[PDB]
Amino acid sequence: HWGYGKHNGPEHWHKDFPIAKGERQSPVDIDTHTAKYDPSLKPLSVSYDQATSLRILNNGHAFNVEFDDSQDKAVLKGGPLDGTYRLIQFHFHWGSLDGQGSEHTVDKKKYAAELHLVHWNTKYGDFGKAVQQPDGLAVLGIFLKVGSAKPGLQKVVDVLDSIKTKGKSADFTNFDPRGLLPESLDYWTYPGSLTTPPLLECVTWIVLKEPISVSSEQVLKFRKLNFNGEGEPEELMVDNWRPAQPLKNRQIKASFK
Ligand SMILES: Nc1cc(C(F)(F)F)c(S(N)(=O)=O)cc1S(N)(=O)=O
Ligand SMILES: [Zn+2]
């Protein structure tokens, strides 16, 4: 199965998923001097007040905090988006050390981790159908740097002990994702793909410029998770990030000057 190891990592994915070498793959390096401010971009709208979390799951490569997307509650609109995108889940990518972990990079700078809030275009009916469309998903990416603790992230941190190994899940209701957002919604956007297999090119990426700060203790607990299943040799869940891919025929647009 695909993973992030030497024999099943990012450099191997193309064999089972040829699209890995496609024309709009993610992540990418964001060259802040080449990104162009775009006035055609409408205001970004993040409406998470009615978000309903359900549970958290360790899927063997990261952990997903799932939400009830059977109704329009937590939605992302505006910005480069047309229509309404419903929040289905969020997860993170992190490193073994503070100097690495993020998937997107800024002027080649790697952050300690990266938060991905995944949303799907409601005009497609369901997530499975949305991922087969060029504009099926919108992922809001947020960088994490080590410094002060992020109060809104602690609830996630303290439940990780209960889902240490692959396949384990735990009830995770009443979690408010608004607590993971930085002050500014300034962002960069470009057409890309899922950063994990099947690497489908169905994502409109919206990466926030302002990172949130998390404590060393908080990220340390992320690093205590396991890639392996219960009762198997321990393989710490770290460095579950895909490196920057060729930008190719794409221009990254900035919402700010
Ligand atoms: N866009 C998306 C969709 C999924 C999906 F699988 F849920 F579809 C995942 S996953 N494998 O980590 O859950 C990850 C992403 S990402 N890293 O591009 O934000
Ligand atoms: Zn991701």
CSV table of C-alpha atoms and ligand atoms in Angstrom, one decimal:
chain,number,residue,atom,x,y,z
A,1,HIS,CA,0.0,0.0,0.0
A,2,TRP,CA,1.2,3.6,-0.6
A,3,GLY,CA,2.8,5.4,2.2
A,4,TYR,CA,5.6,7.8,3.0
A,5,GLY,CA,8.4,5.3,3.5
A,6,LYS,CA,11.5,4.7,1.3
A,7,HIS,CA,9.8,2.0,-0.7
A,8,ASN,CA,6.2,3.2,-0.9
A,9,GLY,CA,6.6,7.0,-0.6
A,10,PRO,CA,5.9,10.0,-2.9
A,11,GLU,CA,8.5,9.0,-5.5
A,12,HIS,CA,6.8,5.6,-5.9
A,13,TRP,CA,3.2,6.8,-6.1
A,14,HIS,CA,3.2,7.3,-9.9
A,15,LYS,CA,3.3,3.6,-10.6
A,16,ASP,CA,-0.2,3.0,-9.2
A,17,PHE,CA,-1.3,6.6,-9.8
A,18,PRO,CA,0.1,7.9,-13.1
A,19,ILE,CA,-1.6,11.2,-12.5
A,20,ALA,CA,1.2,11.8,-10.0
A,21,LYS,CA,3.2,13.3,-12.9
A,22,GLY,CA,0.2,15.2,-14.1
A,23,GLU,CA,-0.2,18.9,-15.2
A,24,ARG,CA,-1.8,20.2,-12.0
A,25,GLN,CA,-0.3,18.3,-9.0
A,26,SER,CA,-0.1,19.5,-5.4
A,27,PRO,CA,1.6,20.7,-3.3
A,28,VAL,CA,3.7,23.4,-5.0
A,29,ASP,CA,6.2,26.0,-3.8
A,30,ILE,CA,4.6,29.4,-3.5
A,31,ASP,CA,7.0,32.0,-5.0
A,32,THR,CA,5.7,35.1,-3.3
A,33,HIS,CA,7.4,37.4,-5.8
A,34,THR,CA,5.9,35.7,-8.8
A,35,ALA,CA,2.4,35.3,-7.3
A,36,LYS,CA,0.2,38.0,-8.8
A,37,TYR,CA,-2.4,40.0,-6.9
A,38,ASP,CA,-5.8,39.3,-8.5
A,39,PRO,CA,-8.6,42.0,-8.2
A,40,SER,CA,-11.2,39.6,-9.7
A,41,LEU,CA,-11.0,37.6,-6.5
A,42,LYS,CA,-14.1,38.0,-4.4
A,43,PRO,CA,-14.0,38.1,-0.6
A,44,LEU,CA,-13.4,34.7,1.0
A,45,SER,CA,-16.2,33.4,3.2
A,46,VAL,CA,-15.6,30.9,5.9
A,47,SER,CA,-18.8,30.0,7.7
A,48,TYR,CA,-18.1,27.3,10.3
A,49,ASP,CA,-20.5,28.5,13.1
A,50,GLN,CA,-22.8,25.5,12.5
A,51,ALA,CA,-20.1,22.9,12.0
A,52,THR,CA,-20.9,19.5,13.4
A,53,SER,CA,-17.9,17.3,14.1
A,54,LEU,CA,-18.5,13.5,14.4
A,55,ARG,CA,-15.3,11.6,15.1
A,56,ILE,CA,-11.6,11.4,14.6
A,57,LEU,CA,-9.9,8.6,12.8
A,58,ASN,CA,-6.3,7.3,12.4
A,59,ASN,CA,-6.2,6.1,8.8
A,60,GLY,CA,-2.7,4.8,8.8
A,61,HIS,CA,-1.0,7.9,7.3
A,62,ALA,CA,-2.6,10.8,9.2
A,63,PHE,CA,-5.8,11.4,11.2
A,64,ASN,CA,-9.1,12.8,10.0
A,65,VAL,CA,-11.6,14.8,12.0
A,66,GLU,CA,-14.9,14.1,10.2
A,67,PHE,CA,-17.9,16.4,10.0
A,68,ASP,CA,-21.6,15.8,9.1
A,69,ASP,CA,-21.9,17.2,5.6
A,70,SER,CA,-25.5,16.0,5.0
A,71,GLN,CA,-26.6,19.7,5.2
A,72,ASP,CA,-25.2,23.1,4.5
A,73,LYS,CA,-23.6,23.9,7.9
A,74,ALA,CA,-19.9,24.5,7.7
A,75,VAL,CA,-19.3,26.0,4.2
A,76,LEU,CA,-16.6,27.8,2.3
A,77,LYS,CA,-17.5,30.4,-0.4
A,78,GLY,CA,-16.2,33.4,-2.2
A,79,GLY,CA,-12.6,34.0,-3.1
A,80,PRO,CA,-11.9,32.1,-6.3
A,81,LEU,CA,-14.8,29.8,-5.7
A,82,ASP,CA,-18.1,29.6,-7.6
A,83,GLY,CA,-20.9,28.1,-5.6
A,84,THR,CA,-20.8,26.5,-2.2
A,85,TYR,CA,-18.3,24.0,-0.8
A,86,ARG,CA,-19.2,21.9,2.2
A,87,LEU,CA,-16.7,21.0,4.9
A,88,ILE,CA,-16.3,17.2,5.1
A,89,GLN,CA,-13.1,16.8,7.1
A,90,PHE,CA,-9.8,18.2,8.1
A,91,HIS,CA,-6.4,16.6,8.8
A,92,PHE,CA,-2.7,17.6,9.1
A,93,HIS,CA,0.6,16.8,7.5
A,94,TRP,CA,3.7,17.2,9.8
A,95,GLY,CA,7.3,16.4,10.2
A,96,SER,CA,9.7,14.6,12.5
A,97,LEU,CA,11.4,17.9,13.2
A,98,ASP,CA,10.1,21.5,13.4
A,99,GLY,CA,12.0,22.4,10.2
A,100,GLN,CA,9.8,20.3,8.0
A,101,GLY,CA,6.3,19.0,7.7
A,102,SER,CA,4.2,21.3,5.5
A,103,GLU,CA,3.4,20.3,1.9
A,104,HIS,CA,3.2,23.7,0.4
A,105,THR,CA,6.3,25.8,0.9
A,106,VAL,CA,6.6,29.6,0.8
A,107,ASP,CA,9.7,30.8,-1.1
A,108,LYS,CA,11.0,27.3,-0.4
A,109,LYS,CA,10.4,27.7,3.4
A,110,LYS,CA,8.9,24.6,5.0
A,111,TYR,CA,6.6,24.9,8.0
A,112,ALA,CA,6.4,22.5,11.0
A,113,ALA,CA,3.0,21.3,9.7
A,114,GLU,CA,0.0,22.1,7.5
A,115,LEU,CA,-3.7,21.9,8.2
A,116,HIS,CA,-6.0,20.9,5.4
A,117,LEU,CA,-9.8,21.7,5.7
A,118,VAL,CA,-11.4,19.8,2.8
A,119,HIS,CA,-14.6,21.0,1.3
A,120,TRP,CA,-16.7,19.6,-1.7
A,121,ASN,CA,-18.8,21.5,-4.3
A,122,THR,CA,-22.4,20.9,-3.4
A,123,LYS,CA,-23.5,21.1,-7.0
A,124,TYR,CA,-22.1,17.6,-7.5
A,125,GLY,CA,-24.3,16.0,-4.9
A,126,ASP,CA,-21.7,14.0,-3.0
A,127,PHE,CA,-18.0,13.8,-2.2
A,128,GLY,CA,-17.4,10.8,-4.4
A,129,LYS,CA,-18.8,12.6,-7.5
A,130,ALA,CA,-17.0,15.9,-6.6
A,131,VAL,CA,-13.5,14.4,-6.7
A,132,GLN,CA,-14.1,13.4,-10.3
A,133,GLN,CA,-14.6,17.1,-11.3
A,134,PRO,CA,-11.9,19.8,-12.0
A,135,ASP,CA,-13.7,22.1,-9.5
A,136,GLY,CA,-15.0,19.4,-7.2
A,137,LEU,CA,-13.0,20.3,-4.1
A,138,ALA,CA,-11.7,23.3,-2.3
A,139,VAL,CA,-9.0,22.8,0.3
A,140,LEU,CA,-8.2,25.6,2.8
A,141,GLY,CA,-4.5,25.1,3.8
A,142,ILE,CA,-3.1,26.7,6.9
A,143,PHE,CA,0.6,26.6,8.0
A,144,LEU,CA,1.6,25.7,11.5
A,145,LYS,CA,4.8,27.0,13.1
A,146,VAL,CA,6.1,26.2,16.5
A,147,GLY,CA,5.8,28.9,19.2
A,148,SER,CA,2.8,29.7,21.4
A,149,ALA,CA,0.2,27.0,21.9
A,150,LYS,CA,-3.0,27.1,20.0
A,151,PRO,CA,-5.9,26.7,22.5
A,152,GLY,CA,-8.3,25.7,19.8
A,153,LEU,CA,-6.1,22.7,18.9
A,154,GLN,CA,-5.7,21.2,22.3
A,155,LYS,CA,-8.9,19.2,22.1
A,156,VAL,CA,-7.5,17.4,19.1
A,157,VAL,CA,-4.2,16.9,20.8
A,158,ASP,CA,-5.6,15.3,23.9
A,159,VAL,CA,-7.7,12.7,22.0
A,160,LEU,CA,-4.7,11.4,19.9
A,161,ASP,CA,-3.8,9.0,22.7
A,162,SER,CA,-7.1,7.2,22.0
A,163,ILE,CA,-6.4,6.7,18.3
A,164,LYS,CA,-2.7,5.9,18.4
A,165,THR,CA,-2.8,3.2,15.7
A,166,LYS,CA,-4.2,2.7,12.3
A,167,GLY,CA,-7.9,1.9,12.1
A,168,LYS,CA,-8.7,3.4,15.5
A,169,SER,CA,-11.4,6.0,15.8
A,170,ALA,CA,-13.0,8.0,18.6
A,171,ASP,CA,-16.1,10.2,19.1
A,172,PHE,CA,-15.2,13.8,18.4
A,173,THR,CA,-18.4,15.8,18.6
A,174,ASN,CA,-18.8,19.5,19.3
A,175,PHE,CA,-15.4,20.5,18.0
A,176,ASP,CA,-15.3,24.1,16.6
A,177,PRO,CA,-12.9,24.4,13.6
A,178,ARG,CA,-13.0,28.2,14.0
A,179,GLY,CA,-10.5,27.8,16.7
A,180,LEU,CA,-7.8,26.7,14.2
A,181,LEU,CA,-8.0,29.8,12.0
A,182,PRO,CA,-5.4,32.6,12.0
A,183,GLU,CA,-6.5,36.3,12.2
A,184,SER,CA,-6.0,37.1,8.5
A,185,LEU,CA,-7.7,35.4,5.6
A,186,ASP,CA,-5.2,36.8,3.1
A,187,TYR,CA,-4.4,33.9,0.7
A,188,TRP,CA,-2.8,32.4,-2.4
A,189,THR,CA,-4.8,30.2,-4.7
A,190,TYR,CA,-4.2,27.9,-7.7
A,191,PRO,CA,-5.7,24.8,-9.4
A,192,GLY,CA,-4.2,21.6,-8.0
A,193,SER,CA,-4.8,18.1,-6.7
A,194,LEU,CA,-5.2,15.9,-3.7
A,195,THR,CA,-1.7,15.6,-2.2
A,196,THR,CA,-2.2,11.9,-1.4
A,197,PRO,CA,-3.2,9.0,-3.7
A,198,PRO,CA,-5.4,8.9,-5.7
A,199,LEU,CA,-3.9,12.4,-6.4
A,200,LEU,CA,-7.0,13.5,-8.4
A,201,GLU,CA,-6.7,16.9,-10.0
A,202,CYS,CA,-10.0,18.2,-8.5
A,203,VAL,CA,-8.8,20.8,-6.1
A,204,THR,CA,-8.9,24.6,-5.9
A,205,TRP,CA,-6.3,25.3,-3.4
A,206,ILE,CA,-6.6,28.3,-1.0
A,207,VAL,CA,-3.5,28.6,1.2
A,208,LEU,CA,-3.6,31.2,3.9
A,209,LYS,CA,-0.5,33.5,4.2
A,210,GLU,CA,-0.7,33.8,8.0
A,211,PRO,CA,0.3,30.6,9.9
A,212,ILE,CA,-1.1,29.7,13.2
A,213,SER,CA,1.2,29.0,16.1
A,214,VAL,CA,1.2,25.7,18.0
A,215,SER,CA,3.4,24.7,20.9
A,216,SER,CA,6.3,22.2,20.8
A,217,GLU,CA,4.3,20.1,23.2
A,218,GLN,CA,1.3,20.0,20.9
A,219,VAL,CA,3.2,19.0,17.8
A,220,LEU,CA,5.2,16.5,19.9
A,221,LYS,CA,1.9,14.6,20.6
A,222,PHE,CA,1.2,14.5,16.8
A,223,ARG,CA,4.6,12.7,16.5
A,224,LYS,CA,3.5,10.1,19.0
A,225,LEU,CA,0.9,8.7,16.7
A,226,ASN,CA,1.6,5.5,14.8
A,227,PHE,CA,1.4,4.5,11.1
A,228,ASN,CA,1.1,0.9,12.1
A,229,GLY,CA,-1.9,-0.9,13.4
A,230,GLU,CA,-2.4,-2.1,17.0
A,231,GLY,CA,0.0,-4.9,18.1
A,232,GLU,CA,2.4,-4.2,15.3
A,233,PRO,CA,6.0,-2.8,15.5
A,234,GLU,CA,6.0,0.9,16.2
A,235,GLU,CA,6.5,3.2,13.2
A,236,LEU,CA,6.0,6.8,14.4
A,237,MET,CA,3.6,8.8,12.2
A,238,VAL,CA,5.9,11.6,11.1
A,239,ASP,CA,6.9,13.2,7.8
A,240,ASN,CA,3.5,12.3,6.2
A,241,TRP,CA,3.9,15.2,3.7
A,242,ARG,CA,4.4,15.1,-0.1
A,243,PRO,CA,7.2,17.4,-1.4
A,244,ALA,CA,6.5,20.4,-3.8
A,245,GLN,CA,5.6,19.4,-7.4
A,246,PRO,CA,6.2,21.1,-10.7
A,247,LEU,CA,4.1,24.2,-11.1
A,248,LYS,CA,4.0,23.7,-14.9
A,249,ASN,CA,1.4,25.8,-16.8
A,250,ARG,CA,-0.1,27.5,-13.7
A,251,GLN,CA,0.0,30.9,-12.1
A,252,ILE,CA,-0.5,31.4,-8.3
A,253,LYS,CA,-2.9,34.3,-7.5
A,254,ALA,CA,-2.7,36.4,-4.4
A,255,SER,CA,-5.8,37.9,-2.7
A,256,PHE,CA,-3.6,40.7,-1.2
A,257,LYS,CA,-0.9,43.1,-2.2
B,1,LIG,N1,-8.1,16.8,-0.8
B,1,LIG,C1,-7.8,15.7,0.0
B,1,LIG,C2,-8.8,14.7,0.1
B,1,LIG,C3,-8.6,13.5,0.9
B,1,LIG,C4,-9.6,12.5,0.9
B,1,LIG,F1,-9.1,11.2,0.9
B,1,LIG,F2,-10.5,12.6,1.9
B,1,LIG,F3,-10.4,12.5,-0.2
B,1,LIG,C5,-7.3,13.4,1.6
B,1,LIG,S1,-6.9,12.1,2.7
B,1,LIG,N2,-6.5,10.8,1.9
B,1,LIG,O1,-5.7,12.5,3.5
B,1,LIG,O2,-8.1,11.8,3.5
B,1,LIG,C6,-6.4,14.5,1.6
B,1,LIG,C7,-6.6,15.6,0.8
B,1,LIG,S2,-5.4,16.9,0.7
B,1,LIG,N3,-4.1,16.4,1.4
B,1,LIG,O3,-5.1,17.1,-0.7
B,1,LIG,O4,-6.0,17.9,1.5
B,2,ZN,ZN,-3.8,17.1,3.2
